[PDB]
Every structure is written in structure tokens, then in C-alpha cells.
């Protein structure tokens, strides 16, 4: 129910903008993505997740 009450909407239309909000939050936003994709970015650039 929190994402229902999460104003502004935490949902992301595309998977690129989902990580984009993460790198612009500096630890203030968490992203729920596939585990296989998650292991990519944590080693991909900019190596901050």
C-alpha cells in the first residue's frame, strides 16, 4: 500500500529512468529490479549501486 500512498509516484515507466532516479537520490531511493540486471549495474558504470 505504500506505493499507493507514495506521492510523488515511485513507479518508473522505463527501467532506464528507474536507475536514473537512484543515481540522482544519493541513498534516498531504492530500486526494485531483476536480480540478474541488478548484478550488472553494480559492476557497470558509474559503479555506485
Amino acid at each position: 500500500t505504500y506505493m499507493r500512498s507514495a506521492e510523488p509516484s515511485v513507479f518508473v515507466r522505463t527501467t532506464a529512468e528507474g536507475v536514473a532516479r537512484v543515481r540522482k537520490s544519493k541513498g534516498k531511493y531504492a530500486y526494485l529490479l531483476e536480480s540478474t540486471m541488478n548484478e550488472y549495474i553494480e559492476q557497470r558504470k558509474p559503479c555506485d549501486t
Partner: protein
């Protein structure tokens, strides 16, 4: 340390020098030398309100200090907000300026109505409080810095204005001891 006229003159000239140095320090935008932007990262000289470029493509175009930056400032705790408020408003440098001016007025006005024996003690307390306010302001500014750099001359202008104020405050209260000491000497005889 000897006589009274010179010691009066020394205290007054020290108070005026401290006031002038500290007023210059507050009003000068040369406090910090660090790499930054005046609109890519480049050498910048900062103060409390504006920070311009050095060795840049344009020279001398400062902006207002980003005390509360936009675009996801991330906020912070109440203590960090308090510290940012003190650094932005510069309440302690200005408070010290006011106390130094008040003490200078008190010592200047002491030549009128010599009988009132608490005006000099008031000036000494004002100068000592101004020195303490200088300490607090310097500390808060350096803490806000840490949140290759070197400090500008105006920061050292305000650093010596604390030393002068305490050395003036030390003398000013010392005058209160001796001039009250004369009261006992003339009462005994």
C-alpha cells in the same frame, strides 16, 4: 602596562584596529581558495556571500553562495540544518561585529562621565564576548567547509581580530582593576 594616557590610547587604537579588520573580513569575498564553478571546476575564491573565479576564462563573476542548493539537496538532520543556517546567515561574525562596535562605543564614551565605573567593565566584557563569537564563527565556518584548499587573507583578517579583541579586552578590564584600586588607596589615607 604603564601610565594611563598611552594605555588609554593603546586600548582605543587596538579596539579601532580590531573593528576595522573584522569589518573588512566580513565584507571581503576572499575567505577560501578552492576549486569550483562560477556559473567546469576551476580555482575560486570564496567568502560568505559570493565566490568568483581565478585563472578562468572569465574573471570576477561571482554568484550568491548556494546555502540551500536546489536539485535534490537531500536535506539533512536538524543539527546539520542548524549549522547550515548559522553558516548562511553568518550570525556569529555579524554578532561579533556588533559586540566590537558596542565595546568601541563604550570605551570611546568612557572619556565622558568618568564617574560611571561600570562602562569600562562593560567594554571589556563586550570585547571578550566578541572574541568568543569570533572563535565560534571561525569554527562553524571551517566545519561547513568540511561538508586541496587554503584560506584567504580575510579569514586571517578575522583571525587576528579575535586576538586583538582579547588583548584589548585584557587591557580594558585591567584598567578597571587599577582605577578601582585607586579608590581603596585614597580611602585608606
Amino acid at each position: 602596562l604603564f601610565d594611563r594616557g598611552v594605555q588609554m590610547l593603546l586600548t582605543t587604537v587596538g579596539a579601532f584596529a580590531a573593528f576595522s579588520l573584522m569589518t573588512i573580513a566580513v565584507g571581503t569575498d576572499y575567505w577560501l581558495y578552492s576549486r569550483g564553478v562560477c556559473k567546469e571546476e576551476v580555482m575560486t575564491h570564496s567568502g560568505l556571500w559570493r565566490t568568483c573565479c581565478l585563472e578562468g576564462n572569465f574573471k570576477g563573476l561571482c554568484k550568491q553562495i548556494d546555502h540551500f542548493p536546489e536539485d535534490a539537496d537531500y536535506e539533512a538532520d536538524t543539527a546539520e540544518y542548524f549549522l547550515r543556517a548559522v553558516r548562511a546567515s553568518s550570525i556569529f561574525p555579524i554578532l561579533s561585529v556588533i559586540l566590537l562596535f558596542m565595546g568601541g562605543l563604550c570605551i570611546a564614551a568612557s572619556e565622558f562621565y568618568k564617574t560611571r565605573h561600570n562602562i569600562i567593565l562593560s567594554a571589556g566584557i563586550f570585547f571578550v564576548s566578541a572574541g568568543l563569537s569570533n572563535i565560534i564563527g571561525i569554527i562553524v565556518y571551517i566545519s561547513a567547509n568540511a561538508g586541496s584548499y587554503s584560506y584567504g587573507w580575510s579569514f586571517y583578517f578575522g583571525a587576528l581580530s579575535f586576538i586583538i579583541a582579547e588583548m584589548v579586552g585584557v587591557l580594558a578590564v585591567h584598567m578597571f582593576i587599577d582605577r578601582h584600586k585607586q579608590l581603596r588607596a585614597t580611602a585608606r589615607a
